[PDB]
Amino acid sequence: YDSLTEVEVEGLSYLYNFADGHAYHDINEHYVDIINNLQRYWQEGKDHSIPDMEKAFKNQFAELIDSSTLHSTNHFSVCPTASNSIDIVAAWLHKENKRTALIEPAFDNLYLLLKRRGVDISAFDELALKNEHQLAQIVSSGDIDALFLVNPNNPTGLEMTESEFVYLVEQCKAHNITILLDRTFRIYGKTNFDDYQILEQSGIDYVVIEDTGKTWPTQDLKISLMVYSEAISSTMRLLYEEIFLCSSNFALALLKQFVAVTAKFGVDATIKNEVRRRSETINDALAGTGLKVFDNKCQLPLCWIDISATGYDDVSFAARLKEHDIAVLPGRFFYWNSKSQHTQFIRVSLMKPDAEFYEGIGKLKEAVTRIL
Amino acid sequence: YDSLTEVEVEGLSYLYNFADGHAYHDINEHYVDIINNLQRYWQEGKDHSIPDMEKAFKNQFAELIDSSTLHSTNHFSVCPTASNSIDIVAAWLHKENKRTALIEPAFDNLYLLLKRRGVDISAFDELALKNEHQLAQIVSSGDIDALFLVNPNNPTGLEMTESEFVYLVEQCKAHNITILLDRTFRIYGKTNFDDYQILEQSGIDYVVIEDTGKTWPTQDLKISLMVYSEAISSTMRLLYEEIFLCSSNFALALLKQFVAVTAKFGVDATIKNEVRRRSETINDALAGLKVFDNKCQLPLCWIDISATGYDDVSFAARLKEHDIAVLPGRFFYWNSKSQHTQFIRVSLMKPDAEFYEGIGKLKEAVTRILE
Ligand SMILES: N=C(N)N/C=C/CC(=N)C(=O)O
């Protein structure tokens, strides 16, 4: 396999697809009114300018995450996909000649995009964010000028606490390190502190990437906030305009309501409760199988599964599941710098269509049982 | 200004924005049912797999342009924007180390993206696609490995003929040259023939880029087909998958019906009838400045302002006083901006009330500026 995405595109043709983690579950009772009134959000995007709709969505999201710093900043761009933002950040890191340490494990495409754009990439252990001594040696090594992170991390669910985030920013400022912050799974995290305030008050250069595609199920009609410090804003804007003039005001109006509704009824009611129900299903299905579900860490709409006791490796166990019409992700690609040293893991995404998920999970337990 | 896009973002804050050419006109009678039933498209995208929805839109488009070769090919990808496809092609041209000559003039972000990907770029004249000796002199030079075109070209409206396209396809075929073909304005062209079949028969490596954002006003909710030959498809698909897993099924299902309506009712009554009204309107409203005419009619208007004694940026700044934003033309000649400061570009596919009122406000400002 070339990439996780190739396994994902392969999984799009299977009856029970648990490969890609995109948000594709059914619209819950709370969001039904948004789809029932799609015309109002079509008309809202038509009646508001492109600059105004961009701030309307940004400040709506800033109210959701309770960050005044994000609400007051205007150094940002709106991309149709979060990968589009990682790519522009990749071009900026290469243009400014920044030796970037990339978190490991991470979704393979971040590494692939960083390499395609010609960035000097270094492997960076994810658990250094929770070990002060480990982070200090890498930051003081002088082999890197930028630090690319995913918080909370995919697929380990590792999440920095406020004291661990403040320690990381202060160390990067001391060594003039630029922080790249992939916050794709931010809403699933258990922490609740203003990371934008800690970033701007430090004065360091940073880029924070947001994303709706792993949270609200809008059929891959997504919006991705790209927020950056003032000192790098004009060059970031330049690189963004080489590709995009804007994103769609219609998409901005639709997702602005999804965020506003999540804020009104709360994240658990609209997001976290159904994720926890789907997490309990796979746990109860895979109890007593030799498959150990990774747990310590926040709960992502993904399930990291140790299959060491199964005797198979990640790829062949996934090949066995594919013969029973079940597509899963082999986990070695997430450890992009040490793939052969991590073959004891598969990943099962959760935010799939409801009927296909619960039936697919049942078929997964029957498939696991037959392979014994 | 450093780019055309930078001017386009500034125009968004003006009362009458004629800068960016993205289709933003109102929904005519032909497409209103589409909006009245946005729920139907939302449900259609949800009720079908991603691979099927990608093929369905491609077949639907192939039926509108009557191309059986596009209908039968499967080496294609779906990007949310046409520039996303341009960038993937530029990454391919760099990875395969192919020296590329890009058409001049052209929208500068084409040159900007190729440059950003580290492509060895050379310029070649736009009219070489209509002079057999001139093109033969370019392809046989041994300096280039690929040719990147916009057909029809923005903003001159130059459209190739069946004779020229076949001449161009065979000419590259002889000299190991890949053809990159930007058909973003395909619907506005007056010709109708199968470029895909002609490219398909030839056997040369090629990449064709489609787009909806210049044609169907969906508030920049867009779909861009990226079709390529078999010999380079696995590498093209590899580069696409580094960025995208998919596009949006809802976006595919929504614009598939836009393509379906245009096919059943005709491209004239749905698209071209209104641009003629808007082209004749601005042409009559400017009867000192000379509109570039010779060549299909794009949803744009190329205007020579040499008679005014002004350069494009100066005139555009003067027009900015009255809440009118337009595009300076020097950046379309990415390889020779200094020699081309005499033209201006105005976009016609704006909201209806904003356009017709805006054109009148243009004539009053142009009359006032010249007094
Ligand atoms: N953009 C891509 N080509 N692939 C994206 C994969 C995201 C995912 N499946 C996850 O984060 O779990």
Automatic annotation (TrEMBL), chain A:
Family: Belongs to the class-I pyridoxal-phosphate-dependent aminotransferase family.
Protein name per Swiss-Prot or TrEMBL: Aminotransferase class I/classII large domain-containing protein
Molecular function per GO: pyridoxal phosphate binding; transaminase activity
Cofactor list: pyridoxal 5'-phosphate
Highest taxon of the lineage: Bacteria
Gene3D superfamilies registered for this protein in UniProt: Aspartate Aminotransferase, domain 1 (3.90.1150.10), Type I PLP-dependent aspartate aminotransferase-like (Major domain) (3.40.640.10)
Pfam families tied to this protein: Aminotran_1_2
Keywords noted in UniProt: Aminotransferase, Pyridoxal phosphate, Transferase
Organism field: Pseudoalteromonas luteoviolacea
UniProtKB/TrEMBL annotation, chain B:
Source species, domain of life: Bacteria
Origin organism lineage: Bacteria, Pseudomonadati, Pseudomonadota, Gammaproteobacteria, Alteromonadales
Name of this chain's protein: Aminotransferase class I/classII large domain-containing protein
One Pfam family of this chain: Aminotran_1_2
A GO biological-process term: amino acid metabolic process
An annotated Gene Ontology molecular function: transaminase activity
Domain Aminotransferase class I/classII large span(s) in chain numbering: 43-350
Cited InterPro entries: Aminotransferase_I/II_large, AspAT/PAT-like, PyrdxlP-dep_Trfase, PyrdxlP-dep_Trfase_major, PyrdxlP-dep_Trfase_small
CDD domains cross-referenced by the UniProt entry: AAT_like
UniProt KW keywords: Aminotransferase, Pyridoxal phosphate, Transferase
Source species of the chain: Pseudoalteromonas luteoviolacea
PANTHER family to which the protein is assigned, alphabetical: ASPARTATE AMINOTRANSFERASE
Gene3D superfamilies assigned: Aspartate Aminotransferase, domain 1 (3.90.1150.10), Type I PLP-dependent aspartate aminotransferase-like (Major domain) (3.40.640.10)
Annotated signal sequence range: none
Protein family according to the UniProt entry: Belongs to the class-I pyridoxal-phosphate-dependent aminotransferase family.
Keyword Amino-acid biosynthesis: no
